[PDB]
A paper describes a structure:
FtsEX is a membrane complex widely conserved across diverse bacterial genera and involved in critical processes such as recruitment of division proteins and in spatial and temporal regulation of muralytic activity during cell division or sporulation. Here, we provide the first three-dimensional (3D) structure of FtsE from the notorious pathogen S. pneumoniae, and we show that it presents all the conserved structural motifs of the NBD members of the ABC transporter family. The nucleotide-binding site is located in lobe I near the interface between the two lobes and presents the nucleotide sandwiched between the Walker A and B motifs.
Two different crystal forms in complex with ADP were obtained in the same crystallization conditions belonging to two different space groups, P 1 and P 21. P 1 crystals contain one molecule per asymmetric unit and diffract up to 1.36 Å resolution, while P 21 crystals contain three molecules per asymmetric unit and diffract up to 1.57 Å resolution. Unless otherwise indicated, the description of the monomer structure provided here is for the highest-resolution crystal form belonging to space group P 1. FtsE binds ADP by both van der Waals and polar interactions. The Walker A (P-loop) motif wraps over the β-phosphate of ADP forming an extensive hydrogen bond network with main-chain nitrogen atoms of G40 to K43. The position of the K43 side chain, essential for nucleotide binding through interaction with the β-phosphate, is stabilized by H bonds with main-chain oxygen atoms of G37 and P38. The switch histidine (H197) that stabilizes the transition-state geometry in the ADP-bound state interacts with the β-phosphate through two interspersed water molecules. The A-loop provides an aromatic side chain (Y13) that packs against the purine ring of adenine involving a π-stacking interaction and positions the base and ribose of the nucleotide. This interaction provides an additional binding free energy for ADP through an extensive hydrophobic interaction that buries 48.4 Å2 of surface area (calculated with PDBePISA v1.52) between its aromatic ring and the adenine base of ADP. Superposition of the NBD of MacB with the FtsE-ADP complex results in an excellent fit with an RMSD value of 1.0 Å for 174 Cα atoms.
Residue numbers in the entry: 1 to 230
The structure:
Amino acid sequence: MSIIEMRDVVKKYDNGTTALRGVSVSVQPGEFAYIVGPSGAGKSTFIRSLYREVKIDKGSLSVAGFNLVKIKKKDVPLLRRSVGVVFQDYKLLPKKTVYENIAYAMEVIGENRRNIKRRVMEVLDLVGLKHKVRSFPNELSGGEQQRIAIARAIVNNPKVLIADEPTGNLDPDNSWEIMNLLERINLQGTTILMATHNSQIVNTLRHRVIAIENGRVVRDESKGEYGYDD
Ligand SMILES: Nc1ncnc2c1ncn2[C@@H]1O[C@H](COP(=O)(O)OP(=O)(O)O)[C@@H](O)[C@H]1O
């Protein structure tokens, strides 16, 4: 049974722009999917519908178990606990150390403080930054900051992880390091949806590719090629 089920979804913004124009996508638990397509296609609108920042107008949508057509306002935080998000402009808390940043991601969802030390150190092992446990974000490279943003996003073991252009401002070597981390997270079972314009990553680290244009899925292929010139 699917962890994300989108059927005939429509989203039209108030200025009349139909950003999702009948979108159907079914993602099984543990899948890794790239979301690709030209600027303005609807990738961000698609991503943001998955954590209920965007409300759909028509269609059905279930994410991480939750029916997003029916979900009550007060329960959106429960959906958010199950959906880790690496914002394209993810900003760490500048006056918190790496440890405090990751720990806060647990405290803020109500986790027991008793669970924090073990989990934070486990995720620092995962991302390979145990030695930066006391660093502040400004002391880290861009690639290190992104790895800590990913650590924050997965700290509560969400069912789904969404990453909006996680390598978009990283050089090739750092981009591959972020991809190695996301791949290891996926092998642990976490479902990953990643919006991206990096054809080399998509064409080399082959996964499912969902291409969106003008609000429509135009291609949905296993181990897919990138398919665009930009
Ligand atoms: N907040 C908004 N209000 C109105 N129109 C929007 C808004 N966000 C996006 N759009 C429009 O919806 C379409 C899809 O945008 P977006 O989802 O950001 O695409 P992408 O992420 O692929 O660049 C575009 O025509 C865009 O201008």
